[PDB]
Symmetry: D2
Subunit: 245 residues, 4 copies
């Protein structure tokens, strides 16, 4: 009576090396794990060591399948009817060379969750994409030139089916006025202006475009899209988000 | 070209100094503000300048009523049906050492949110109370000693009636194995050490014990209680939360 | 023999409200304090409560004089021949209106140190200034428009004599292609492009210009100047610094 | 127009995945890189693209020698007399629980720096070891219990000879009231709790005890030892450092 069920309990912010397999190759990274389960009213404690125990044992590559695998095994190991694992980490993508084979690397911040309710599995995903946004109402008053600044686009979402980290990166960068590339001389600098100068976007635009994509994709049962446009003109961001449904 | 509502759009993390009135006095602090409005589909973009305007003008001491006032004035100006203000800040309170009674400030992190949805007002608040936790497992099994650590309890709740920040602080501080003070003399430090060793609590115990107090407060419609213990024997945290309902 | 003198010891990251007096008015803020003293080889411990004790007692406005005052009083209170106090906090500046009396606020991150060696006082200062830098080699390849991004300029320095937080802000913004103002319509936006478009600067330029000022000022016995130009084109900064002498 | 040398100029916080070789094995981690060169007075600007180039090309396991190799290759390419590379990263090591012997990784933060000054090479390294501290004052004065907390010991040193990261870890872990492990079973947790209560240490004691070990290592020319204890009875830290010489 006095004691209540605890929605979730376990470890949080355990920093752990993970080798990650996505559909454009395997890569090694450093993740930060949160791992928890439902604890019923009559049980005083969960078992804290078993969460770390699980991760130490499982040196298998982490993909969508392996994340289900761990999460079901977790509820198993700790004798609970529910629980979640989250894995946050930087994710790197190789961008092949638009000039002579000089291809740069770009870093993204990604976070995968896996959840077991009673036997039912559910997964969700969060990905932050840094982009170079350009303003179209700052080119409208100025005869020449415009207000350019770095902007971040986060995309949180839930699906029944597997959805690649990169598919989401791409969903976002497609709409990007111009995305972040690696330093290449004169050649790669000419067409970074013109792509963002004649089609520039606001914080409101960026969320709409990305949302439109996300509505289309029947796998995505729900999402949130945030864009943050760090005004160079003030020490504070322009911000907007959309949730669906 | 466009056909998508934006749930919220505005400025985020405007860092702004403020003067705050609470039951126990008035203080000067520094705040992060996020302020945003609903944006209808065919409307292309909100009016970013107007947020900042609103805040430069109002020099009024912040208080439950003032937040309401400010959030209704915000949807008015930017001409919108719904909107949100959130103000985050360190909050100070004067404490009394338990034996010697020497006075010292302790610091807390607060976030207060006002929301308007078609004339209706809601306010929620988040508060973070650092306290001490001491492990009952370590106490029991050991011929002496008990590992203890600083821990963050974070309460978020919603209410129609105003709940004082200090009120949420007392609910937590009371239940903590023991609480923190800036100033302690030998007898004080003797007191607190022994207090913790007498009243050990799992992360489960804290959130449970705090949740109950909250449930016993008719004003509170909903809450989350989190407790993170930065285990002094691990390099990760123990973590638990209860959500009501 | 086995035990050594400890250069410094005390409290670190004590978060405390301070009312700060500079030569353009008094303002209230929230500071983070580090406070320490030399501990000789024969002494096992310092006195940790006295650092907090001092701050609780002294509710006098903090200016250059008051910071000496505290620092000498500190070594006194804790019976040591040396020690330092540092105070970090955000500092706000009122920027009067270039159009009809609509004047915005901008936040800066400042940090003041005070040190007593044997009786000799020494002070130093650190100030981070956010600026809107524009590139002049990105306007050189493009016929119209250029690569604009937010950049941060930190200025650390030591003086015999008082040097105002604002004098340093100004030293930096003078050289600024354009500095951060508050949102004003059409009027204030026209001359934010032209000031940074015809005189744009790199990371190397910004450090040189600011250094030149700092060499001039006979009060400044030494400094460091850092500029960080967060490339919107990559998730990593362009960086440079100069130390003198 | 210009007449001022720049001590260092380059890119900062390039976030890059790496493979690292140490005495006890080879691991995959993620790194922040800062790379910079000396810039002579009348030379206007360094060549930012070339830093990134250098790193995309070299896929070699990182190791003491490789850092040297990389920093000499860097001044070569950018055509400069002096320069600095610094690589920061989480570092993992496999530990053995003290009683049960169960294996678990603990995580550390390392920063390795190479510097070239006119053909001469220097390397320094910084390392942060989380450990447990337990107060001897609290132990003494109290009829039972001792407040303890997690604490960060941070060692920075310079040497002509290579010092293994794990070597610096062992110097600290040994002196800690007790050390951390990811996995502990009851007997293990019993062990560590009791170990700390037996070997209590002021922040003064730790840095002192660790400093001595360092002094006893002819390879180390200079060092700083810091220890921050996140006091479980306060909301600020105790802090001390020794600098040699
Ligand atoms: N549930 C819980 N356990 C904790 C906390 N802090 C803490 O040190 N522990 C340690 O973790 C233990 C929980 O059980 P455990 O994971 O070691 O597993 P167990 O001994 O119950 O059985 P096992 O050997 O089958 O895993 C407690 O007995 C205690 O020693 C906490 O806040 N909550
Ligand atoms: N020096 C030191 N003191 C500590 C640490 N941790 C800690 O709790 N303390 C507490 O702080 C005390 C240091 O003295 P204090 O500031 O209370 O002053 P005091 O009792 O020596 O004399 P006072 O009453 O004249 O100030 C210790 O006795 C201890 O209870 C630490 O790491 N170093
Ligand atoms: Zn325990
Ligand atoms: Zn103590």
């Amino acid at each position: 009576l006095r004691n209540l069920p605890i929605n979730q309990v376990g470890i949080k912010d355990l920093r752990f090396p993970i080798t990650l397999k996505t559909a454009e190759g395997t890569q090694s990274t450093v993740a930060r794990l949160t791992m928890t389960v439902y604890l019923p009213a009559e049980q005083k404690g969960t078992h804290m060591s078993r969460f770390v125990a699980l991760m130490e044992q499982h040196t298998e590559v982490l993909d969508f399948a392996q994340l289900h695998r761990l999460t079901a095994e977790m509820v198993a190991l700790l004798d609970s009817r529910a629980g979640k694992i989250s894995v946050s980490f930087p994710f790197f993508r190789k961008k092949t060379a638009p000039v002579s084979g000089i291809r740069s690397l770009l870093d993204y911040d990604v976070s995968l969750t896996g959840e077991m309710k009673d036997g039912a599995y559910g997964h969700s995903m969060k990905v932050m994409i840094p982009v170079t946004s350009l303003c179209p109402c700052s080119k409208e008053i100025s005869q020449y030139g415009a207000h350019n600044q770095r902007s971040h686009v986060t995309v949180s979402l839930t699906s029944d089916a597997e959805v690649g980290i990169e598919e989401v990166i791409d969903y976002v960068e497609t709409q990007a006025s111009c995305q972040l590339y690696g330093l290449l001389k004169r050649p790669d600098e000419k067409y970074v202006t013109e792509k963002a100068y004649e089609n520039p976007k606001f914080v409101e635009d960026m969320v709409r475009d990305v949302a439109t994509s996300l509505i289309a994709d029947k796998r995505i049962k729900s999402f949130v899209v945030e864009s943050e446009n760090f005004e160079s003109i003030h020490n504070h961001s322009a911000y907007a988000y959309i949730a669906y449904p």
